[PDB]
Amino acid sequence: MDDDQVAFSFILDNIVTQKMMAVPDSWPFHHPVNKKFVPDYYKVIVNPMDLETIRKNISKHKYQSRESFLDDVNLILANSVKYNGPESQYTKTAQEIVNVCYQTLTEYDEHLTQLEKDICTAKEAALE
């Protein structure tokens, strides 16, 4: 009915909270960075992204499939390599946040693939 996206965004939020925010030493990427303590971030990094704004984006039902969801989560690893270098421990930790979020999205792959058809057929049909 009208629970397709509510369910979808529920499964995503649980990935963030119980598989990504649980990566060891993912302390830094949980919240947005304060610009008074990092004097260059918000102008070297044009598109900031943290896991708190991803959840607040999830609760707004913004991700209608993993492609738009993976876009945002891939951006915090792209942001740490563009600010800390590809070999920094921060970047290495962001690589594992992205990694745990990839096995988990294909560990629930089929079941997720069906919700994506359901949500969009509703948006297809609503137009036609």
Ligand X SMILES: C=CCCN1C(=O)[C@@H](C)N(C2CCOCC2)c2nc(Nc3ccc(C(=O)NC4CCN(C)CC4)cc3OC)ccc21
The site string for ligand X over 64-83 (x = CB under 6 A, - otherwise) reads: ------------x--xx--x
Task: Give the gyration radius of the chain's Cα atoms.
Answer: 16
Task: Quote the DSSP letter at residue 3.
Answer: -
Between CA 94 and CA 75 the distance in angstroms is 10
Interface pick for ligand X out of 11, 33, 70, 98 (rule CB under 6 A): 33
Burial class of residue 54, CB neighbours in 10 A (0-12, 13-18, 19+):
buried
Q: How many residues bind ligand X (CB under 6 A)?
A: 12
Residue 28 in the binding site for ligand X (CB under 6 A)? yes
**Residue with Cβ nearer ligand X (9 or 91):** 91
The yes or no reply on residue 93 touching ligand X (CB under 6 A) is no
Instruction: Report the C-alpha gap between 26 and 50 in whole angstroms.
Output: 11
Which spans of this chain sit near ligand X (rule: CB under 6 A)?
28-29, 33, 38, 41, 50, 76, 79-80, 83-84, 90
